[PDB]
Amino acid sequence: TLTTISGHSKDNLALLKCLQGETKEKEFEISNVLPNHKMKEKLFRENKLKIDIDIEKDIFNYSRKNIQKIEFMPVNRLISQSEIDGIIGTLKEVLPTGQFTSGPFSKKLEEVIGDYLNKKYVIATSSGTDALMVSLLSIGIQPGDEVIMPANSFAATENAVLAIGAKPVFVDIDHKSYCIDPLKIEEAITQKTKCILPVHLYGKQCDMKRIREIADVYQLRIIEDACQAIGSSNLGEYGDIIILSFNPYKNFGVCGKAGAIVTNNENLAIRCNQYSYHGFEVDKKNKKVLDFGFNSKIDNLQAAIGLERIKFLSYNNLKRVFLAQRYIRNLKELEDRELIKLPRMTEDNVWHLFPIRIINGRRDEVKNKLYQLYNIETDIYYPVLSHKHNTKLVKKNYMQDTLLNTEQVHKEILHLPLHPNMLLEEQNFVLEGLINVNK
Template sequence: MTKIDLSRKIEVPSWVDALLKPTKIGSGELERQWEEIGDEVMDVLKKVMPTGKYTLGPYLKKFEEEFAEFSNSKYGIGMSSGTAALHIALEAMGVGPGDEVITVCNTYVATAFAISYCGATPVFVDIDPKTYNLTAELVEKKITSKTKAIVPVHLYGQVVDMDPIMDLAKKHNLYVLEDASHAHGAYYKGRRAGSLGHAAAFSLYPSKNMGAYGDGGVITTSDPELNEKIRMLRYVGQRVKFIHEVIGFQDRLDEIQAAMLSVKLRHLDDWNNRRRKIAAIYDEMLKDTPLQLPYVADYAHHIYYSYVTITPNAEERTNLLIHLANNDIGAFAMYPILVPMQGAYEDLNYKESDFPVGSSYATRVLNLPIFETFREDEARATAEAILAYYDRA
């Protein structure tokens, strides 16, 4: 049973209030996307709705096959959310009580929650100061006899250096589950995210590079046994209807979302290229500022789920966020509190000093607005506002 203490004091960063109001630059991404593809989406909805088949039907099968092919994988399994995708994939890998799963400290909390849902213990590692991702060297130091799996997170749209991770997993007989929720369509040495581990979990939350009109997720794998186990677990533990072999879950993606996602998948590579063009504008205009700009590894094709900078110090992050908000520009900080420092994991007794790079970056991370319908003039206006802050306009 989860114990909830409603008397716990919650400290809210001073800059949060400045970011709650809609801004002229950085808002309206999904509304603009609808203007671009709304007719295509409505056309496919008109085909789905009359069928009366809204779960586990032909449109889900079609999307699963399309996304698997897109991700260089044999199988795609539509899920109710990215969190469910992570959880069910780990369950299929046999992760359970007494096991440890290694992941990174600076991710969305759902990465760790999925491990906890299995009854296992998340083990957190620090990050590489250039890519913000975990590395095989950091992971190897945390492997014990209890380690069952590794969950590398392709943070912000750049893929983890996966070959050393897979070599490490083979050496220690571990599963690798990619958390690819920021990396739809990203490449690693010419291979798509989603095809690099034993399985991968993608969130299809609306704001992702490819999102549903609500919650959704998808798992990719080329392992036929994992594919069958995942399908059984996502639909109440059955392979044959009414025969429930194990305690399963109700975590399938519905037909309507799948049909709409098939439309979006056709646009994804183009949308990612648009994000890359916006990132190139930021790179050029902000190269002489004190901000640490995104580093792109030579093995990676970055698709910029977020354009992430690191400010020189925490105070400057706060001042810049407020400055941009005052100029009607929406920026934010993802993620300002490391997962092991959250109240949900205080029983694991981690300290900020356990993650010297991650802890420092958490106080200084500053995400600039970027999405596929973000205009070049808006990117330039954002960069100019930052230059004005530094008196370099």
């Protein structure tokens, strides 16, 4: 009869159904962790859900504003004046300390992230790319070792493997989630394989249970690229190391670059900490114990900013799931008419990006006409597959690669604008263009 909102995706889907009266027979409390701060302030009173919240008016301030155009991700809309005020307030305390490399806000953010993820050890880093590189080194990756990964992620995933001399081995995706197909991983394992690197793409989690099953047979490490999936329930249950990004355009970000390494493995965590600061023994500067390292810890200043901005995470993820649901329901007719395929609602998705598939070769037409005739920006995350860049490396090593389902899906994929400070009037403008263009 009572759910305590933990700030993750499972409870956010349940809360939404309550708010929309799709259940209205359950009661909610909310936990006091920092990622719930804005949600608790906005939607709760004395740790009970406020009475008659109007999602459209109270959460999105729907007021029949007239819309002329839609940008896909206008960065000036992704931070709120309330966040800015809190950032200025905390920087007024950080700046006079002079502590701008390591510092107490870094440690606090590591503690918040560890609690939120239920992991023991957190190393906050200067980016998700750096987190991934360090984590590969900590598991003992050496030049020439093979890392199995999909070919449809952001370039950072493959780049971190290549930066340390290791070899991406691309495996195709499934037909349902844009995630690595686990039934194709075993075939790609070689004497040289050291690691499986699944990507929780667009905010949706891979089938980690089956991936872990294969990794245990072959004694392989799993490092999870969760850079788009913060807030997703049970993230990391099966991986050795989980990688986060706090890039400013992620569901949670700082005001600059940052990320994190998350693990329960103390051996790996200690090596990650050493490699992230020059190979030095922890808190013994200038004394190397590893052969080398990077300069890749988070900035204390960005950690302070992160501790302000993470207060909005639960609430902004709730707004994302509302918006994704609204797309799915309102484009359903285009799915019925076999013009598009839409994503489905699931408990794990945090909706960092909203993918649809435009069928029958029409994707480019729809994208171009959405822009030119309706002033609606859509985007393709990402426009070139890993084995298709026009680079010397591709011409040397991956000209043989054939990834059937990844390549076909790549001709169909289109992402719709979805970010938590968009107006519902802005989403309606996208909806009526997509319906209008499909006739």
